[PDB]
From a paper:
Bovine β-lactoglobulin (BlgB) is a small protein (18.3 kDa) belonging to the lipocalin family. Due to BlgB ability to bind different classes of bioactive compounds, its application as a nutrients nanotransporter or drug carrier is currently an object of intensive studies. As other proteins from lipocalin family, BlgB can be re-engineered to gain specificity of binding selected bioactive ligands, and this requires heterologous protein production in the appropriate expression system.
Crystals of rBlgB obtained from ammonium sulphate poorly diffract X-rays, and data collection required the use of synchrotron radiation. With the exception of GH loop which is disordered, the electron density is well defined for entire protein chain and shows that disulphide bridges are correctly formed. The density also allowed to resolve two alternative conformations of N-terminal part of the polypeptide chain located on crystallographic twofold axis. Additional electron density, not observed previously in structures of bovine milk lactoglobulin, was found near N-terminal fragment of protein molecules. Fourier maps also showed unexpected elongated density in the hydrophobic pocket of β-barrel. 10–16-carbon long fatty acids were modelled, and the best fit has been observed for 14-carbon myristic acid (MYR). The ITC experiments gave Ka values of SDS binding to rBlgB in agreement with values obtained using milk protein in the same conditions, but the binding stoichiometry in the range 0.17–0.41 was much lower than expected.
Author numbering:
A (entry chain A), B (entry chain A): 0 to 108, 115 to 162
Write the structure that this text describes.
């Protein structure tokens, strides 16, 4: 009834600063990655760590039948690869793996939704392959993979 | 720029008669398996071949913000594992593989959506494994896998 996955030790949050694109997503419940109504079908556009180690997130979200940019803050906690968001719901963010150059893997809160981010709007097989491997104990009932044209669009088409 | 997949030769359509559940789905475009607005996010409930070899399909579909049962007819063609549907759009149906007992794999029409059907609302690893294998040249940007509770519900939750 249990399941485990590698995570980040030695995460220098300051190094994740910049522009990013959500290249893949997966969740354990199909509804979470719902195009209209699911608050985890979000497209990360920029990450902004603060001097003390909080994290400003710029993301897009379908809302009022349109793609919309939210500015969101995520507070640090005692674990540097885990953060928190008290918006409509209470949301924990967990970074699993990153080389800071190419890919960043993270998950969000019994139903998890995970993303593979990249710094350029191209597919990268390494990133995906590490996404697939990092997830493969988690049973993911939905998986989404975007193409390079979608990476540069309003909520990925 | 090209891609190919095994299909059915020797398909006795009469043997696919009965109750079925859509256990998995995949498509090459993410939007096709859209919960609200995508006419391929359909849940097959019963197949009814006619004496001559047409195919009556009972499926569910989200519509007017609610799960709804459609009765749909699919005409045979010169290829017995390929059928046609002229509804709102023009839709070709292609059966890839079936043992008639356990699993039935089919695809529907540059964007394809494919399903793995089963006769009982349980997961079957064989069926999924043959689904995964039958698809794995097709590049599928979305993949959905349902659990046994969803198999017996209104549009799978
Ligand atoms: C390390 C990258 C982390 C990016 C996390 C952003 C995901 C949070 C978006 C959803 C939170 C708000 C949900 C809500 O209150 O409606
Ligand atoms: C062998 C099993 C085949 C089941 C095929 C049923 C899928 C067709 C449903 C979508 C067709 C209607 C689309 C539309 O006109 O809006």
């Amino acid at each position: 009834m249990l399941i485990v996955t590698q995570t980040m030790k030695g995460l220098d949050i300051q190094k994740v600063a910049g522009t990013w694109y959500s290249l893949a997503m997966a969740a354990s419940d199909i509804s979470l990655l719902d195009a209209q109504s699911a608050p985890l079908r979000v497209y990360v556009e920029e990450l902004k760590p603060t001097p003390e180690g909080d994290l400003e997130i710029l993301l897009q979200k379908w809302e009022n039948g349109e793609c919309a940019q939210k500015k969101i803050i995520a507070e640090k906690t005692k674990i540097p690869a885990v953060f928190k968001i008290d918006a409509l719901n209470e949301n924990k963010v967990l970074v699993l793996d990153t080389d800071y150059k190419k890919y960043l893997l993270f998950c969000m809160e019994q139903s998890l939704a995970c993303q593979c981010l990249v710094r350029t709007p191209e597919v990268d097989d390494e990133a995906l392959e590490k996404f697939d491997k990092a997830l493969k104990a988690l049973p993911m009932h939905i998986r989404l993979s975007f193409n390079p044209t979608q990476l540069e669009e309003q909520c990925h088409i």
